[model samples]
Target chain A: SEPFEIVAGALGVAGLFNNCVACFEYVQLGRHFGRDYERCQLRLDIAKVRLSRWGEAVQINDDPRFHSSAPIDKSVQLAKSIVEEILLLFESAQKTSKRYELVADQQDLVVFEDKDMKPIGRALHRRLKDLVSRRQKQTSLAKKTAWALYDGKSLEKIVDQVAGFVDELEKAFPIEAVCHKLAENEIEEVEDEASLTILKDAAGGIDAAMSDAAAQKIDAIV
Target chain B: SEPFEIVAGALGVAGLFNNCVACFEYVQLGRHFGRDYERCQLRLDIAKVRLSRWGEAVQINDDPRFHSSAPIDKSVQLAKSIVEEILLLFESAQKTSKRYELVADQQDLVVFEDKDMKPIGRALHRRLKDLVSRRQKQTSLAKKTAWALYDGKSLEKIVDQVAGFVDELEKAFPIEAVCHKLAENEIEEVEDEASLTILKDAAGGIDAAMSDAAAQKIDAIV
Candidate 1:
């Protein structure tokens, strides 16, 4: 039971972390492309839904899925690493003039180009490409996991994808800063009530997703 | 009990955060003053000890103190605000040429002076002076708390002192960045194990202080 609680708590924290990173990424894209892509918002929405599911899962004491710590721990760890790695990229980019550009096609792509449209470091550009590919794959996998039936196989698959995504992101955005950003203001200026409410609602929304899924399961049994 | 857990966890996180900030302050002072003040190291040591106490407190079960959330919650919130306010100072200082110099006497003081020994903005200078006085008071209070018996009253007093210090620090150094230094490196591009070990040890040292205090109380009772 304690293990379940730990795992659930980890997942909830990890989900929140991922949402933060996704929000940051959206801002980055807006700055680089001079337009807010709908895709970025969609990414955030996906993150919100995923967060809700995990938040609800942790609270369900009787759920068999809540009893297993291994999968939950792995998933949470994977999300944590992914969030950290993405943040590392943002920190690394701050020191250099090379801006990351996103090109929209059937497949989303990341291009590292200087202010004058000149090619930047080949190594960096290659790494960025690899990261973009990995991100796309993770997004796809998340979509699948969200809609698919909740079972051991599906859960394991999602965990594996998350873990792989974390590994790829870490490799692509190798930590570069001499001193890491200890704390950056994310929700500082915002009113505490508003921010707190939003956070609470987001977690509640995850719980709502759980109720909906459980209801559907009951309906099928009937 | 759940509220108590939340409060305790928050305290542990807050303590760790303060320790990180203390470590950063040590680095900042070392860079600015061109010498490692033993005082800075001592400050870090103090923060480390405090962090450990909070961390250990969070893990303790069957403790009556852990049953009520109010004091713990208040203390944790105070600590959070304190950490944020102190970090804000560091951020504010990054943009300014004016340096804060510590003057040692029975009455400790912080003098705001520039490189050319010129008087800077009157408003900023006056605020810094006030902040210095508050900080001095906090330091004095902390010294008292460190030496005194560890009890609820003493703990609450220290939390009050911490809260006051944070408020002063925030007033002294408000947000000034036109565009924030989105991310400044605190720890990166180093041997992960070594850096992590130092942080872990520092946090553990904080817990050791708690153990000493508890032991002393037990001895007195016996």
Candidate 2:
């Protein structure tokens, strides 16, 4: 059943008040998973740009059901929900242990997963299906929608995969502490040097060519 | 004088054709400056998707001037022109420098720039202005066109900036070689270690929290 329909039906139609609580088996799963929220947000923005342009030449009223706005709006809704789920997950983590304090030092975020995350993933998948269904209603819209779908699907998978990673944190816990120490050590040794190398290597190739050209000009003159 | 108009008017015909030849000072512009061609192609695909959806609701002849096909076709023309310019620029570099051959190691290509690049940039800017002008002719068409202009402008800027970098290569030659040596050393020293650091740090926080929670449970039981 559609998640919403299930709720609406149970509530019996008047602003809906049906509480059918269902919980999956919870596991401690290993901990110490982190996410790059900046990267995640960037991907979401890109998805928005792609999906927002669908059926753009058509008026919203022409075929409102399969209009470009439908998928665009659906995507926005999905993005918000995903962000909310992630935030809530992190919030719960904070209450569970002081060691899991949210770190704002970088793009990464410590992640934890429980049974509650599975529903979020399920909802995301459902939305993807809905997006596809709407596209099927219009051939022209479908072509454009299909173009953007790859990114949409990838974004969803990333969210689901992250959720899974969080749930398995129990088994992965000790590994995390050791990895962090190593990471700090690694960052110090390589960050500036690697960046400089990339810049120099790029410049070196060009400089060599320029020098040779100048040298050839002198040889020709001699 | 307007580029096309200059030629058209000089031809002394209704649909004028006074083809004028213009070229910027060409240079070898040094090579081995790579670009991610896959990323480039992806961006092009995105542009096509945006422009194609411009007049989706209206048929080709409905408002022929403002129809979606015009922008779509124009964008295609523009993309080809852009690619041709880059290729030609690279081809010229190949002739000038044998050691700095175009690397086929990855999607990235070693990019170079010269005064000759100005024409390409000029055409891109001109086309952009033309797109906006055309958009002004129809409100509905303008809305869709507006959606694409941001990307269109950004892509052009990237091309222009790259061209600028290539042209200025002569003065910046020495710094390139030094940087390259440093880059190589840096890459060898810290590549894997840094990545591991990133992974571990993120997970470490989460693991600590989870471990704390488990200890709390033990305390409660004792």
Candidate 3:
């Protein structure tokens, strides 16, 4: 039976974008971060970072305006719609990628060689994880906390399109000054190599804590 | 200012459930996995595991019936709607949880002590991750998606209600035999410690790869 088309919990443009983030996690380019397909993941992740950075630039997480069903003013409604259209683009891209995976499944062939895509997550993933940890409203917990470029070719097309729409979105709202300010912030930001090792250690600690005892404890209950 | 009330993608019941998983990821209970609230996360993950295992038992992943707009027959339409209702319940629960977090934020207070809930991810997260890696259509990658229950009291209410709706769903479709059979599979299931450590190691390796260098590399672009 068709689910009664009811109004779902109405989170606005940012929530819609989170749905895009949710779909994008499935693309699972490998963890190795090495190949032709792998490079596509970096590119894809870069697109995601840009889009998210833009969200941060707009104060999308903290600002109440983006969270509601409509823009705060009539002037920004076009920006809202553009975000809507952008989500559809990402969703369609995700679905099309899924369909390709299924097609490969029918042939009993894996689409990509490596399934664990930890390496490909790179810079964008860290930023997202930080945002989520900070409990930012604009951030979606739906992100893999993940890529399918089809092949490098088809993947390239969608990645570019993602950039295109995001660019279009920024133009619709005119955050040019804000974006430059963001770049300045990034440029002046302190970088430290020690933090990398600390992050590496923390990541390990995370893995160690998820013991089999824990997994089994979980296995029994559910 | 409201978004146009256009139909979003018309995925059926299972797709809706995946949305539930997407929301659950936000409830980060911390990775260390010790204490009252942390236990709540495990319980919540257990509920999620049950819901998802039921999906597997019903062959919800492969069968086209659950994925399409309508059921294969009118006989189970109510089942379809029940699933619809379940998704709303979970979504509402998630939003409500978020509201509490925001209230805490206003006071500049962190809701739970630990931001990373990797240890608490335990079994349910493992299963959901597996389903995603396997490209199972019913699974949503939205699930480290890892958690908050405004303390444990409110969480318990929603978790029990989750069981309540799931029970309603099963009766609506009468998958009794299948449920028992699934129980059997779990009971005799060989619990291995080695696989757990392997998973742990992989988890650590995954951490090592997402380096600050990679993060810095990403820093340069967009």
- DockQ (Cα-based) for each candidate: 0.01, 0.01, 0.02
Please give the ranking of all candidate structures by TM-score, highest first, separated by commas: 3, 1, 2
Across all models, the iRMS values in order are 18.3, 27.0, 11.1
Instruction: Residues B1-222, candidate 2: write the lDDT tens digits.
Output: 122122212221111100110111122121322232222322232232122222221221243333222233432223222222333332222221321122124322334432233343333323323432342223221111001111223343333433332222212223334333322322232223333233223222222222233333344435
Model 3 agreement with the true structure over A1-222: per-residue lDDT tens digits: 011111234557667655544445556653223445434554554455556656766777666777778565643454455455455444334444443444354433235544433552344355533443343344434334223545444565556666765665666566877765553443222134332332333222222221222332333335
Ranking 2 against 3 by lDDT, winner: 3
In model 2, which regions exceed 4 Å deviation? A1-34, A37-57, A60-122, A125-129, A136-222, B1-222
Highest-scoring model, DockQ: 3
TM-score of 2: 0.18
TM-score of chain B of 2: 0.20
Model 3 TM-score, 2 decimals: 0.37
Tell me the alpha-carbon RMSD of every candidate. 24.0, 29.9, 25.6
Best-performing candidate as measured by TM-score: 3
Which 10-residue span in candidate 2 chain B carries the lowest summed lDDT? B14-23
Query: B-chain TM-score, every candidate?
Result: 0.27, 0.20, 0.61
Task: Report lDDT (Cα) of residue B174, candidate 2.
Answer: 33
**Between 1 and 3, whose lDDT is larger?**
3
Put down candidate 2 lDDT per residue, A1-222, tens digits, no spaces.
122222212222111100110101111222222233222332332232112212222222243333222233432223222222232222222222222122123322333332323443333323323433342223221111001111223344433433332223212223434333322322232223323233223223222222233343344435
Q: In candidate 1, how many Å is residue B52 off? A: 18
Q: Please give each candidate's TM-score.
A: 0.22, 0.18, 0.37
